[PDB]
Amino acid sequence: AKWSDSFDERTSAAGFVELGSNVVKLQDNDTLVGQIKYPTNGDGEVET
Amino acid sequence: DTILGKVDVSSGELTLTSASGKLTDVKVKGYVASEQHTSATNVELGLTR
């Protein structure tokens, strides 16, 4: 998932956050839900 | 048509729409759980002659 205020955390750029084990998968009755904590600033863990 | 999709935590009481919405206002019918014994109705008697 790539927000505009994102950080990749693989390269040092605003890119896709790889959802590490906080993946939003198909829950019951065919819906997704989930809150995820993406890093915004490179090396500043402000965690939007 | 417009689909409405929300999620809320029953403990912390944070309602939050998450699937869609191009709307302005929503009226709900929630309550406050009488599990934790916070408030109830008292039935203390009365009398006159």
Burial of A25: CB neighbours in 10 Å, binned 0-12, 13-18, 19+: exposed
Q: Which two tokens mark A21?
A: 């084990």
The pair phi, psi for residue A37, each rounded to 5°, is -115, 90
Torsion of CA A47, B4, B7, B11, to 10 degrees: 130
User: CA B30, CA A16: separation in Å to the nearest integer?
Assistant: 38
Q: Comparing C-alpha atoms, which of B47, B46, B48, B8 is closest to residue B30?
A: B8
Greatest Cα pair distance in chain B = 63
Question: With an 8 Å Cβ cutoff, is A46 touching chain B?
Answer: no
Optimal mutation site among A28, A31, A36, interface B, most CBs of chain B within 10 A:
A31
Asked if residue A15 lies in contact with residue A7, where contact means CB atoms within 8 angstroms, the answer is yes
From CA A11, how far away is CA B29, in angstroms rounded?
A: 47
Hey, of B4, B6, B7, which one would you mutate to test binding to chain A, going by the most A CBs within 10 A of its CB? Answer: B7
Q: What was the experiment behind these coordinates?
A: cryo-EM
Give me the amino acid identity at B26: V
> Is A33 within 8 Å of chain B by CB?
yes
> 10 Å Cβ neighbour count for B18?
15
